[PDB]
Amino acid sequence: ITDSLAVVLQRRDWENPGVTQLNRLAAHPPFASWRNSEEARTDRPSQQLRSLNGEWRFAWFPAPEAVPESWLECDLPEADTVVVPSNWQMHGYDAPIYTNVTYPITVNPPFVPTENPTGCYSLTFNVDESWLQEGQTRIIFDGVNSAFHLWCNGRWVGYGQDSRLPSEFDLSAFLRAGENRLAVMVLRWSDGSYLEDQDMWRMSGIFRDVSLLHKPTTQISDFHVATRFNDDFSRAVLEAEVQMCGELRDYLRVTVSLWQGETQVASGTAPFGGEIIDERGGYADRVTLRLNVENPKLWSAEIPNLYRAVVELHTADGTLIEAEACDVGFREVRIENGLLLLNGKPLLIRGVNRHEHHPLHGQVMDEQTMVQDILLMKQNNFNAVRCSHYPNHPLWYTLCDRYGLYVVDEANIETHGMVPMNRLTDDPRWLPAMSERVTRMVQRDRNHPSVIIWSLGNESGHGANHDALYRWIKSVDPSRPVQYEGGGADTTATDIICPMYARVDEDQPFPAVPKWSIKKWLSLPGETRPLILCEYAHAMGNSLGGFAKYWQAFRQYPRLQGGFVWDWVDQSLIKYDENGNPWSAYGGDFGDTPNDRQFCMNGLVFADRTPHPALTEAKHQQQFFQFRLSGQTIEVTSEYLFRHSDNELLHWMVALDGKPLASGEVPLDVAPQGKQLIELPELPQPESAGQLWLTVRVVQPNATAWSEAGHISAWQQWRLAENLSVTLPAASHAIPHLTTSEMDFCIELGNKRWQFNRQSGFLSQMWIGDKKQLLTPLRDQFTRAPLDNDIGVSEATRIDPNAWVERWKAAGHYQAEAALLQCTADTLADAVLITTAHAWQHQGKTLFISRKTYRIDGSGQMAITVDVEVASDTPHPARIGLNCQLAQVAERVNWLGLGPQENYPDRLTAACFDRWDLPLSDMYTPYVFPSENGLRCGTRELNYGPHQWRGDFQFNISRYSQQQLMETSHRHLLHAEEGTWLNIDGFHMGIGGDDSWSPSVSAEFQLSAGRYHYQLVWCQK
Amino acid sequence: ITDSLAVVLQRRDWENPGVTQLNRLAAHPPFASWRNSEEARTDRPSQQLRSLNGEWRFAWFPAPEAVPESWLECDLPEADTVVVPSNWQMHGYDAPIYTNVTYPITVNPPFVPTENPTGCYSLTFNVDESWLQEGQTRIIFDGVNSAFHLWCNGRWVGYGQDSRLPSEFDLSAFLRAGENRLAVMVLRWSDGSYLEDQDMWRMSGIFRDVSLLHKPTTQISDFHVATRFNDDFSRAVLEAEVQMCGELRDYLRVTVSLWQGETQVASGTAPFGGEIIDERGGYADRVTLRLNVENPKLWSAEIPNLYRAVVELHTADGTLIEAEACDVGFREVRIENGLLLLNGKPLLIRGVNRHEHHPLHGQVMDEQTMVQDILLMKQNNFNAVRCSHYPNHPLWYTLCDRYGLYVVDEANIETHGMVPMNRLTDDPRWLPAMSERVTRMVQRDRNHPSVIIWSLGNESGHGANHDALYRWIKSVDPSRPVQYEGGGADTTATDIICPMYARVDEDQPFPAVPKWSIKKWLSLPGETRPLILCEYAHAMGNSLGGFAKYWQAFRQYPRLQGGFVWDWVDQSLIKYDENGNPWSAYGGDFGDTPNDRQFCMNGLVFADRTPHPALTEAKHQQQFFQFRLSGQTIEVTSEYLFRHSDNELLHWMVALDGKPLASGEVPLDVAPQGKQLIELPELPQPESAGQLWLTVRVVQPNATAWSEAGHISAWQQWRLAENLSVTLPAASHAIPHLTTSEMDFCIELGNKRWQFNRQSGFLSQMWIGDKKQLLTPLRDQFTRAPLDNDIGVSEATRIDPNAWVERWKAAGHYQAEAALLQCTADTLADAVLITTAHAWQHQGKTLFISRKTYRIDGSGQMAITVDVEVASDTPHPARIGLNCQLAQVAERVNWLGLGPQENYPDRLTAACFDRWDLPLSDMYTPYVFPSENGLRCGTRELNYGPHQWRGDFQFNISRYSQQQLMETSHRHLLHAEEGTWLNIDGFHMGIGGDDSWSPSVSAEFQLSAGRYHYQLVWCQK
Ligand SMILES: [Mg+2]
Ligand SMILES: [Mg+2]
Ligand SMILES: [Mg+2]
Ligand SMILES: [Mg+2]
Secondary structure, X not given: OOOOHHHHHHHOHHHOOOOOEEOOOOOOOOOOOEOOHHHHHOOOOOOOEEEOOEEEEEEEEOOHHHOOHHHHOOOOOOOEEEEEOOOHHHHOOOOOEEEOOOOOOOOEOOEOOOOOOEEEEEEEEEEOHHHHHOOEEEEEEOOOEOEEEEEEOOEEEEEEEOOOOOEEEEOOOOXXXXXXXXXXXXXXXXXXXXXXXXXXXXXXXXXXXXXXXXXXXXEEEEEEEEXXXXXXXXXXXXXXXXXXXXXOOOOEEEEEEEEEOOEEEEEEEEOOOOOOOEOOEOOOXXXXXXXXXEOOOEEOOOOEOOEEEEEEEEEOOOOEEEEEEEEEOEOOEEEEOOEEEEOOEEOOEEEEEOOOOEOOOEOOOOHHHHHHHHHHHHHOOOOEEEOOOOOOOHHHHHHHHHHOOEEEEEXXXXXXXXXOOOOOXXXXXXXXXXHHHHHHHHHHHOOOOOEEEEEOOEOOOOOHHHXXXXXXXXXXXXXOOEEOOOOOOOOOOOOOEOOEOOOOOOOEOOOOOOEOOHHHHHOOOOOOOOEEEEEEOOOOOOOOOOHHHHHHHHHHOOOEEEEEEOOOEOOOEEEEEOOOEEEEEOOOOOOOOOOOHHHHOOOOEOOOOOEOXXXXXXXXXXXXXXXXXXXXXXXXXXXXXXXXXXXXEEEEEEEEOOEEEEXXXXXXXOOOOOEEEEEOOOOOOOOOOEEEEEEEEEEEOOOOOOOOOOEEEEEEEEEEEEEOOOOOOOOOOOOOEEEEOXXXXXXXXXXXXXXXXXXXXXXXXXXXXXXXXXOOOOEEEOOOOOOHHHHOOOOXXXXXXXXXXXXXXXXXXXXXXXXXXEEEEEEOOOEEEEEEEEEEEEOOEEEEEEEEEEEEEOOOOEEEEEEEEEOOOOOOOOEEEEEEEEOOOXXXXXXXXXXXXXXXXXXXOOOEEEEEEEEHHHHOOOOOOOOOOOOEEEEEEEEEOOEEXXXXXXXXXXXXXXXXXXXXXXXXHOOOOOOEEEEEEEEEOOOOOOOOOOXXXXXXXXXXXOEEEEEEEEEEO | OOOOHHHHHHHOHHHOOOOOEEOOOOOOOOOOOXXXXXXXXXXXXXXXXXXXXXXXXXEEEOOHHHOOHHHHOOOOOOOEEEEEOOOHHHHOOOOOEEEOOOOOOOOEOOEXXXXXXXXXXXXXXXXXXXXXXXXXXXXXXXXXXXXXXXXXXXXXXXXXXXOXXXXXXXXXXXXXXXXXXXXXXXXXXXXXXXXXXXOEEEOOEOOOOEEEEEEOOOEEXXXXXXXXXXXXXXXXXXXXXXXXEOOOOOOEEEEEXXXXXXXXXXXXXXXXXXXXXXXXXXXXXXXXXXEEEXXXXXXXXXXXXXXXXXXXXXXXXXXXXXXXXXXXXXXXXEEEOOEEEEOOEEOOEEEEEOOOXXXXXXXXXXXXXXHHHHHXXXXXXXXXXXXXXXXXXXXXXXXXXXXXXXXXXXXXXEOOOOOOOOOOXXXXXXXXHHHHXXXXXXXXXXXXXXXXXXXXXXXXXXXXXXXXXXXXXXXXXXOOOEEOOOOOOXXXXXXXXXXXXXXXXXXXXXXXXXXXXXXXXXXXXXXXXXXXXXXXXXXXXXXXXXXXXXXXXXXXXXXXXXXXXXXXXXXOXXXXXXOOEEEEEOOOOOOOOOOOHHXXXXXXXXXXXXXXXXXXXXXXXXXXXEEEEEOOEEEEEEOOOOOOOOOOEEEEEEEEOOEEEEEEEEEOOXXXXXXXXXXXXXXXXXXXXXXXXXXXXXXXXXXXXXXXXXXXXXXXXXXXXXXXXXXXXXXXXXXXXXXXXXXXXXXXXXXXXXXXXXXXXXXEXXXXXXXXXXXXXXXXXXXXXXXHXXXXXXXXXXXXXXOHHHHHHHHOHHHOEEEEEEEEEXXXXXXXXXXXXXXXXXXXXXXXXXXXXXXXXXXXXXXXXXXXXXXXXXXXXXXXXXXXXXXXXXXXXXXXXXXXXXXXXXXXXXXXXXXXXXXXXXXXXXXXOOOOOOOEEEEEEEEEOOEEEEEEEEEEEEOOOHHHHHHOOOHHHOOOOOOEEEEEEEEEOOOOXXXXXXXXXXXHHOOOXXXXXXXEEEEEO
């Protein structure tokens, strides 16, 4: 009866920050309750640990109040059978919401709305009665969002808050032998929701594992590990502290053993009872052991050496009560003199922020995905990751410990939508709630070597609660620094200056929380801390422009120790069309209101873990080897702090315009932080005209755990020389023949014909034989289908006038009208010459002027010369080029220029100058939200079909017109147009990306010169 | 129904540290809701504030479960009518318990025992319906111990923990017009009890005020005040921050005005809306005003200048919504360079720890008592007080603000009985509970100028929770330092080294938490903080020995800035005997188990606020004026930091053995921290033999608020000279006449006769005329009825062998047997001479030997000479003297020596050498727990009755024998013996008191010389 819903829900615990749990056991590191030492030592599965994952019954309601009393006793008739874990929105019950800052519910702390989607889960299972006779049986929920009540066999058990950490309960007294029934009522909204405003999809349910653990009555209740070293790390001390629960007897003992695989490295045994701590004594129920280790093998992301530690609770006779274990990594993290050091050396963090996301499963995680991520990261030169913005699934840590990644563990607290941001964080009333969120995290994760920094949360302003908590951690775990960006990134609550989106050289001086140029930030008066950006380089859409500026600064300034890119994967969800066709969905695609559209897609990889082209730029800038070329000598520098280049081969190669003249291989032998000089054999000195280029690549001959054999980990290229062409084209035996009509000028030469419309002044058509080559005339183009960065946050309802797009639109760039000023034709002795001049205007203003010359010679080549003038007072244009729709459609694209991937002016360091050949399809970048894409820069020759173009330009080629890209909101809706659309740019604006809600394209990448000149040659084969 | 006990008590909130309150409103400074500015400004009573104090119905039960459902609806038949506030133990319901460290309940956090004394209070009252139409009506409980549930009109309202701070609830929605009924169920024990283990009587109930407050819907919800100054305090800025609750509208305004009595000093008006604090904005519902004040009058305990500040919430038109106010003191507290400064000057704290205690009302406080305490303190030279160990009744602060006392406000947290002491404080699970205890205190008290330091609690070891909380305060209120003694007195959680019971020069090196000599403590490597003892000089019983050593150190070392004596009043309770006679009761007197007996009595004053003699010693050592004598010049030094000696007169006086030769008066004119030289007129130079002494006294001519006219605030005395007596007694015309019997020697001379028993060797009787003068023979005495300090914690069951008493007992001091070694009589020409020698032995060992001579001359004077030898290996004896029971009983006692109050060797600086005359009754000190008392030292002549004694000794005189004192446990049980008992000591051991649970008598005060000599003359008139 007091077990009744009517009674239980009366209290409304979910609308009270004073109640964050009821009957929840204490937090602790991960337990298995092994009953055999070897099993524990080898990480076998323990039988006192059982999964409850699988099929469960589920039913949904609009409000907790609508749940019917019966539910407690009997399964419902209308209940479905569902898989657990999972997020109910993923099964159709309600919609997932994609809002960023703005809370999904109404802001009225600590109330939640009355319609509050309740999900009743239930499960019927069997308990072995052995478990029922002796010991303790508890249930563990790894994650339930956002709050929940629990009943067992009709009996009310407890309540829990904080969707990111485990909730544990003693079931010992509710269990019956045989058949038992759990009834879990999960709520969408709770007072906990106010602390969970992260920018992600808002979902719900039992999204992480469900388990049962059987423990002895007298058990190991907690244990901590710590490593101390001498000056040179030649000697260490492992110190373990163990605590017990139960019946304390003098025959109890604890033993701790450390293993290196198979070898036992150290052991220690002792009886309970600590050292005196105060006037009242010590802890009778704890004991601390100290093991000495000589010449320990250190853990690092470069070489994740691990040890195994076993903790056995036993009697003096030798009889084992239970065993627990963990992997141990010997490393020291410290900040000294402004620098963050690891094992004595200063790190350089190549990081990324990563959310727990699956296009299919929502927020549910699994081994396979986790590993995939890890591999990709490691293969792309990343060495660290940040748990944006809550503790992650337990297994993650282990994987990082094993694979070698530095991790920042972050408390599940984000109050982004409050106003001001610290409205709750500065309130004592919310202190207790915040507290649990930090303490519990620490208690659970602190034995993992890969966690090297603790974070208090995200975007919750700065309040006293933060200071109090920062201090708590500092007292309980002094081995790791603490960081927190809120309230200015440099408050008293952080050991590291960790801004988000601060620029390299420009200051953004917002009131109260300005963001200084990172180089300047360090030098502010009295500042002495290291600086590591918690978030930088917003990878939304076609982005990562300017990435290299950061790397260069990081490399030049000691106290600039790196950052975490934002972010790893796009948060897109899969949906289906009527033909059972899947497509990538974003904010608002589920009828979700309010929503933030594409804002959920900022990753370096697509939801499916397929790479955006930006990933290469990252990989290259983050490479661990650096090169300098001096004469015939290449100087290699290693940025590894601990390892020697012992799985590295250097391949080099010389080519003349794509043609290879010489190749070689040399094995690397560089010590961490050292240099290696590589003497090049005498290089070939061709006579032929062209550009000679040297390219080097570093290859990993042997496979590793995160890479295959032959993995390329770094590269670099240099232009060695250039032989200018002083040649003259030979005589033609004829010259083109001109023909004036009223409508056009027509030039003919053999099968070839070209026609210029006299009213438009454009080359309107051209034939080869009797085959027309164009579907659209060739014309100047000054705009681009806007990128996400060009748009920022400008919405149609709420326009942002500073956004590039808003400015282009308003200046009429998109709707300017060409006006023919002049179109003449003349016959020279060697060719035919056409001259045009056009002006683009808009409402009286002349935005641009384009003057050209076309010269067709007896060889059938058409040379085009373009000179453009841009009104100094018009917003700089996105591009300066030409376009046309070719009639033809071919398979491949071949070019001599930078590649092979998409590259833009402020994102092209990773690209290489060579000869590339790809399928047409590869020249298109399927950004979920479409825009200008696919460009390749520094191109000297382009071939497609029978056509060939030469000059010095940038281009893109595909089946979609700029107009289509710009008018279609999702990639799945684009339709291939009639032929091939080609955009040849003399110049193109950068893409930016320092952030996606303000203009972020640096000045050096804006087309601000006023006058531009370019030229090309078009011909057929 | 959910309002039902069965349901409400089901949760068992009182056995869960996770639930510390339910539906409790937020904390804030004190509100009245004035509706008129002048009323607020003059502190008139506000009508929106109503007391519920008075008669209430009460009923008691053994357990919450035994409360009957009806209670909710209907008053009980068996209910009594009781006064509220009060402690139910004081009304007979159950017993108050006096335990110190050891918890009154079984240690099993967070469970409380099943028998848990429930007190059901109820009250029926009327609500004006005006209050019912508009606004908000809340109820406020200033203090309820230890936990409680509340119902209004049958409806369940909320729950609360923390017996020391106010609990508030919104009654708005439960009130009916007219007749309403409250039903409050109070519990003795709760999980809160684990944090309330202070050494005091354990009581319960509604011990502080009950009120109702009517507030507007749109109100002032909080406000803070702050004062900043320039370098020289010539200019200040008052800064007030105000927050509102309700409906925010643009016509709202806030005005803050500052008044100096009648004069308006400054004002400011503004509309809501703060400055930007972070990326999301500012607080729309707050506003901060800044008033400039030139040449502010500073607040100090020396001159409590106050200002009045008024806060008015109003509309733009001028219509007042509500007003709040407070007294403001302009002062700056800071620690700089190792020193604690106030207004720029380094303090010297003359403090005392004070509990809230009434012999009659228990823990209930009232204005009258509070003021009495304040007066006494101020009159005894105290300037500060510590709220040992919880926030006090609200009015206290105000009184201190007004009278001028520095206060340390202390959170209600003490976990003394845990093991180790920090078992809970170091646990995150208890963090939330601890947190509320600190935050709420700060929120309530922070506007009071007299609070100058915050304290995190007492005897709770040291845990991370403390660090976190220390930091929270530092962030929220940087204007006051934070201190906390636990875990060693010098942890990271304190800004001041604040030990308890550390000695002046000796170290007490306990493991983990040693207590160094305070002079040494400051110099420890790397230490730089100031040192102020949170507790020192344990005033238990006949104590305060050694007080002067502290004052001298404090005065010599800059960083030793004082301390707080332990403690103000004895915690004794009144009881009655069958004749309706009241007596002072202590631990165990109520059948209370377990108990700590007299340990609850450690004050400088008796429960009735009558002074123990130690108070004078304190008063003198703490005096604010110091004197030096050079030649005929007296040099006066002032220890006032802010005031000039403007109500001070110096009276001086010269006397020769008690006879006055010259007197004078001079007015003081000393600036704070200055000197004044006083030239003495030529002093008299008597020829007569004796000691010439100069005495000075400082008098306050005019009354003050805490003193009457003619109050003596300081004194000092010096021996100027001495003229030795070279005189010879004149001839007698006869000499005594001897007579030997077998049994005795009998000497006769006139009416006078003396008899010496030949078997005992003692003067057995003496006559004057036919009147016998003694009831007991004159004999050596080497012991004393033990003081509290002599006993310490030795209990009869659990003996403490280091306690002095244990050592004396064991050496047989108390049961040694005198043995006559020799008894001879001889006739000289001028007198009769008797010689004796005795040995005191015990089990074969000779402890002492006493050799005397008695010489009776023709003048009828008997001169006695005593030479004692003490075995070097026996514990030093308490005293070396003689005693006897005189037959006579007189009215007065007259002596020439130190006085007038009781003084001991290590407690006699406050005493003065003069001629005193008191009533016999005054020579007895009625310590509730009886012991040796009443001594007066440095006595040269003593007169009682017809007798007169001369020499140089110490004595005591009363109707109780040492044996009676030592055998009677309470003062009320002593019975006057037959005549007068006199103890004449040649020497006496010090009393100690650095602590009362270890030997604390310094070596210089132990009778360790081995050989002692003394002499006297006895005669009659
Ligand atoms: Mg809650
Ligand atoms: Mg956010
Ligand atoms: Mg509780
Ligand atoms: Mg205590």
